[PDB]
């Protein structure tokens, strides 16, 4: 079973991609989706196998790279982190595969689409099941290639092309530090297997652990799109919506978080990287919420919400509470997909519009869609007793539970992020369904009213709901967002649970905050985010369809105008990235091509030598006149000059000086 | 509607709206190929999956029915 | 509705067929054929790597220690 979970999604993609001519459309869908449903079944079994029994399993197939000290194997280790991480990945992939049968049922290239998401599935399993960092990097590099291939699926659109170069290149900037970090691991340990790296980590130099951890952090920063290497993620929405659910909402962006959770035995022995973890996430979770409020595209808001919850995962790792990050990484996966997939049915219902300015009143038109997106929104805001409530709210308590300056500081930093999350949550939910119609007649013109004389058969198209394949994943993902967090809260959080006792998630006694979080935090702080969520959600409802001028007053106030555009334009980060990084790199190349490689290197080199030597040779040819008197005089000059050199015992430098000096005259014209 | 496209372009992923008339017959053939080597992967895994802990006899553990490194242990423990 | 698969593999139209240029026999039966025959023969080539030689000695060296309980007690 443990090698069939790995291999089975790969077979579906190969047949769907290289023999999709032979299997057709529905055959390619049947094969790829079955390979994922069956792989899902086994990974559910493997959860009970590994996790509930504490029996990890090791498979070594053959060796990948053998060079002296380094022995990298094609090998796979299932542990408590592996089977836990495989649950959201395989369940969501199965639903998105089913979701795509009815979503991409109009696109022509439908075999290539299903082969790519079945190839992404394979890579995400390769990543989390590896024995070592280098086999993990095959899945990491492959998830980037799959995300590139899906962000540029509509490759005749230039916008999708630029958003795919951004995704592939930003994620290589992280892989550079990831690759260098593995170099530091090989240097200091002679291998990079997880067993060898984590057994020896407590006894290794504290400074090299900082060096290794910093490189792991920068690599994790790019794929989890933290506040520095984040620009590729909102651009990834150029691809089809089901791609945005599986790869840019619940699985590939969670790879960076998994890397720090996997590397926890090493990074626990350096508080420096945990302090940067705690502040990277805090800055990211508020940097994201402040931007998502001002976005006019729905998918852009959901992408920005994904990076705020990813910052919440990174912040928790900084608290050295990797169980909560795993719990939140899993709980976020289920409801975020439902939000992307529920939104996806909204874009499909309307003529593929993605602007809030053209929606409203769709609640009577999308009753199931609104209900599931409301369930997903309460779990995202952490409304009490919902799946997302048990996970994210406990990170906030843990942050204050760590009775330090940074912990209390980033509890404040994250409590604004909670406030603005509620505000975007309301904006998506209100402007799409609960607001007055802002789109045209076509979205709303039902058939009850006639409005037509001889064309009553067609032209109605009043934004109907989806079909079976489109809504079934939405209903399945709704159950999880209501109940899943409660059922599994003992496995991850507990108070003394022993789920990760294979040294999968390592926590050091020195800075454990679990006991104080449940006991030392005052009651008001524990329940505060609930108070701030109800208060800030009614105000958002009150400032839209109840008062609703104050926003317009603010959007035209001179001060409010600039901060609207400051946050809509994403902190102006992309503006400064292009003109100071990529354009500068582009202009540096221009200098080398034009001034150096087709310029001075040619002139102070072959072309210059060629130009001058032709001139010099023609001048010496001029001395050739075929006149015997001139040639006699040349002989007499050379004769007496040889007498000068020999008789006078001149220095040989003089003779060399004369020769060059004569070439410089002969170089001079006339 | 349906996007016009060249009929002279050969794609391995099929093309534009490519569904063969024999899609079911070939999907059956490929599904057998996928199952056939997945079983081979299953056979190889069961022989080389190595564990350091033995599951309890009363516990749900479907791995017990094929994987050798604990299949022999159950019969070895059945000797007293 | 779906369309039947179409296209001209190698650019050969349905009326005509592919015409051999002269490189096919040498490439498939010679270069590729030799590479396959080489592959099976490689499966029988005896092991001559420095590791499998050094693993054998290193196994004995660790056997004469607390590691790697040796089959024979000598």
């Amino acid at each position: 079973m443990y090698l069939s979970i790995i291999i089975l999604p790969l077979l579906g993609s190969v047949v769907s991609g290289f023999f999709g001519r032979k299997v057709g459309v529905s055959g390619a869908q049947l094969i790829t989706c079955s390979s994922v449903i069956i792989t899902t079944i086994l990974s559910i079994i493997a959860f009970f196998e590994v996790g509930f029994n504490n029996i990890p399993v090791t498979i070594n197939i053959f060796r990948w790279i053998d060079s002296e000290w380094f022995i990298i194997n094609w090998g796979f280790q299932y542990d408590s982190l592996t089977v836990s991480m495989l649950i959201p990945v395989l369940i969501i992939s199965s639903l998105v595969h089913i979701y795509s049968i009815s979503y991409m049922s109009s696109d022509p290239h439908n075999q290539r689409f299903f082969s790519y998401l079945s190839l992404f599935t394979f890579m995400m399993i390769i990543l989390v099941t590896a024995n070592n960092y280098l086999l993990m990097f095959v899945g990491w590099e492959g998830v980037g290639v799959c995300s590139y291939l899906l962000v540029s699926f509509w490759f005749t659109r230039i916008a999708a092309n630029q958003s795919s170069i951004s995704a592939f290149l930003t994620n290589r900037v992280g892989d550079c530090f990831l690759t260098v970090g593995m170099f530091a691991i090989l240097w200091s340990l002679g291998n990079l297997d997880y067993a060898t790296v984590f057994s020896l980590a407590p006894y290794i130099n504290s400074n090299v652990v900082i060096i290794i951890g910093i490189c792991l952090l920068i690599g994790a920063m790019a794929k989890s799109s933290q506040v520095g290497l984040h620009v590729w993620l909102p651009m990834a929405m150029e691809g089809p919506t089901p791609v945005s659910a599986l790869i840019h909402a619940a699985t590939m962006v969670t790879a960076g978080v998994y890397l720090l959770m996997r590397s926890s035995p090493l990074i626990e022995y350096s508080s420096t990287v945990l302090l940067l973890c705690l502040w990277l996430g805090a800055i990211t979770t508020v940097f994201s919420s402040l931007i998502g409020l001002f976005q006019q595209d729905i998918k852009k808001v959901i992408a920005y919400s994904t990076m705020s919850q990813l910052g919440m995962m990174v912040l928790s790792i900084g608290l050295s509470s990797y169980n909560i990050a795993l719990f939140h990484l899993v709980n976020h996966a289920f409801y975020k997909a439902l939000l992307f997939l529920g939104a996806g049915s909204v874009i499909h219902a309307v003529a593929d519009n993605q602007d809030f300015r053209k929606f409203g009143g769709l609640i009577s038109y999308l009753p199931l869609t609104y209900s599931v997106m409301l369930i997903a929104s309460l779990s995202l805001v952490a409304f009490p007793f919902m799946t997302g409530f048990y996970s994210k709210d406990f990170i906030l308590e843990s942050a204050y539970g760590q009775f330090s300056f940074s912990g209390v500081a980033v509890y404040i930093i994250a409590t604004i992020g909670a406030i603005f999350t509620t505000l975007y949550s309301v904006k998506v939910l209100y402007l799409t369904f609960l607001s007055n119609p802002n789109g045209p007649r076509t979205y709303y013109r039902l058939a009850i009213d006639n409005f037509f004389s001889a064309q009553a058969i067609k032209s109605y198209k009043p934004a109907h709901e989806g079909d079976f394949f489109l809504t079934l994943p939405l209903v399945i993902l709704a159950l999880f967002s209501i109940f899943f967090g409660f059922i599994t809260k003992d496995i991850f959080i507990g108070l003394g649970s022993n789920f990760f006792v294979d040294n999968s998630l390592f926590i050091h006694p020195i800075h454990e905050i679990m006991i104080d979080t449940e006991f030392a935090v005052p009651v008001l702080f524990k329940l505060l985010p609930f108070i701030f969520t109800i208060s800030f959600s009614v105000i958002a409802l009150t400032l839209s369809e109840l008062l609703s001028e104050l926003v317009i007053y603010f959007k035209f106030s001179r001060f409010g105008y600039n901060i609207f555009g400051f946050f809509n334009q994403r902190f102006l980060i992309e503006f400064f990235y292009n003109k100071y990084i990529t354009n500068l790199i582009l202009n540096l190349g221009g200098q080398i091509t034009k001034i150096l490689d087709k310029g001075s290197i040619e002139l102070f080199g072959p072309y210059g030598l060629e130009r001058g030597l032709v001139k010099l040779s023609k001048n010496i040819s001029s001395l050739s006149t075929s006149h015997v008197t001139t040639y006699a005089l040349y002989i007499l000059v050379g004769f007496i000059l040889y007498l000068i050199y020999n008789n006078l015992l001149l220095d040989y430098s003089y003779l060399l000086l004369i020769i060059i000096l004569l070439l410089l005259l002969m170089m001079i014209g006339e | 509607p349906k996007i016009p496209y060249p009929k002279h372009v050969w794609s391995p992923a099929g093309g534009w709206y490519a569904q063969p008339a024999n899609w079911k017959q070939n999907t059956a053939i490929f599904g057998l190929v996928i199952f056939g080597i997945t079983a081979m992967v299953w056979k190889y895994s069961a022989e080389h999956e190595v564990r350091h802990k033995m599951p309890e006899p009363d516990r749900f553990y479907p791995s017990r029915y094929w994987v050798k490194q604990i299949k022999d242990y159950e019969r070895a423990q059945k000797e007293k | 509705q779906y369309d039947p698969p179409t296209g001209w593999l190698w650019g050969v139209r349905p009326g005509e067929k592919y015409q051999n240029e002269g490189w096919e026999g040498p490439f498939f039966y010679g270069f590729w054929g030799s590479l396959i025959v080489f592959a099976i023969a490689y499966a029988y080539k005896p092991d001559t790597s420095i590791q499998t030689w050094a693993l054998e000695e290193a196994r004995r060296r660790l056997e004469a220690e607390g590691i790697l309980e040796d089959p024979n007690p000598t």
Binding site: - | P20, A21, N22, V33 | -
Partner: peptide, 17 residues
């Protein structure tokens, strides 16, 4: 409704495995 042969590539890949 033209039929599709499995094709030599199917047997080359399957036969290779």
């Amino acid at each position: 409704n033209v039929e599709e042969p499995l094709g030599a590539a199917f047997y080359i890949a399957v036969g290779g495995i």
